[PDB]
């Protein structure tokens, strides 16, 4: 497998975190994977020409859709799930939740599961 680490990027500030040395703050494989996941969610699909069709999501386009609330919930689940699962490190994403806190303004949760989160059988002959 041998996934590799990457460099931090504070999405709050929209800038790379760099040490007092001036070098960019490296970080772990798992940290890099989390960095990648948020980026892929925020990247709309088919539009940013640097990436292929695999990368990116389509959540923004769903806003203009005329589908009902329940239909939009499933589409959110499909879109987020499809976008994340392309990464090798992903094991499973699910346990989605939704809260239409206002009449038409939504908050939703989902839980991601890594490959390392798997449970291993203990036996040998």
């Amino acid at each position: 497998l041998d996934l590799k680490g990457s460099f931090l990027f504070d999405f709050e500030k929209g800038e790379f975190v760099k040490n007092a040395d001036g070098t960019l703050k490296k970080c772990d494989k798992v940290q890099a994977y989390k960095q990648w996941c948020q980026k892929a969610i925020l990247t709309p699909r088919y539009k940013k020409a640097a990436y292929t069709n695999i990368y990116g999501s389509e959540i923004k386009d769903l806003i203009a859709s005329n589908l009902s609330q329940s239909a939009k919930e499933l589409e959110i689940t499909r879109l987020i799930k499809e976008t994340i699962l392309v990464h090798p490190y992903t094991k499973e994403v699910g346990e989605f939740s939704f809260n239409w806190l206002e009449n038409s303004r939504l908050v939703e949760y989902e839980f991601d599961v890594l490959t390392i989160d798997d449970e291993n059988i203990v036996i040998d002959g």
């Binding site: 996934l3 590799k4 680490g5 990457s6 460099f7 990027f9 494989k29 890099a32 990648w36 980026k39 892929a40 990247t43 020409a49 640097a50 990436y51 292929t52 695999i54 990368y55 990116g56 990464h87």
Partner: protein, 188 residues
């Protein structure tokens, strides 16, 4: 025309460029959407587009076997061969009206513009007066070079303005002075 052989380097695939660019990295991840990928992929893509379009087109215009347009003309000038130029349609237009009426050179008369077809503009080459006979003939020329023009006998019937006393403007015979730009392949 002849097909253009292209060097293998100028026809490199975009991914091949990007793959070579990422060859040196072995510590940091290079997955699609990763930061290293973000830094490198637009460069690789831009190289391929420039390499495949900009450079190959430059090679095409080099030789007369595949050059075109102004580029082919200059290669004609290398060996002193010039392509032929177009000419304006030339002919005569008959005018009828009050004898006192006077028609000046440079007056513009056209064909009947329609939804299907646009009017072809013609200019008079002479100044005349109708004083002797009600009918007069004035030499005219199409304002645009090319076989555009060379109209039929009765095509010219429109005056852009309105000259006092003129009863009818009609071309008598088809124009013949027009000729188009020489064909590139014929010139090649």
């Amino acid at each position: 025309e002849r097909e253009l052989p292209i060097p293998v380097f100028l026809t490199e695939d975009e991914d091949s460029v990007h793959e070579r660019m990422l060859s040196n990295f072995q510590d940091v991840s290079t997955l699609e959407g990763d930061f290293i990928y973000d830094a490198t992929r637009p460069t690789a893509e831009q190289i391929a587009e420039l390499k495949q379009l900009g450079l190959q087109n430059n090679l095409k215009i080099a030789f007369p076997q595949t050059s075109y347009g102004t580029y082919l003309e200059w290669l004609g000038e290398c060996k002193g061969v010039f392509k032929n130029q177009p000419t304006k349609a030339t002919g005569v237009i008959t005018f009828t009206g009050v004898q006192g009426t006077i028609i000046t050179k440079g007056t513009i008369v056209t064909t009947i513009a329609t939804d299907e077809k646009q009017s072809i503009e013609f200019e008079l080459l002479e100044t005349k007066t109708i004083g002797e006979n009600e009918t007069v003939d004035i030499k005219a020329e199409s304002r645009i070079v090319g076989t555009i023009g060379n109209v039929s006998k009765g095509s010219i019937s429109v005056l852009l303005g309105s000259i006092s006393g003129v009863k009818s403007i009609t071309n008598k015979e088809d124009f013949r002075g027009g000729t188009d730009i020489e064909d590139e392949e014929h010139f090649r």
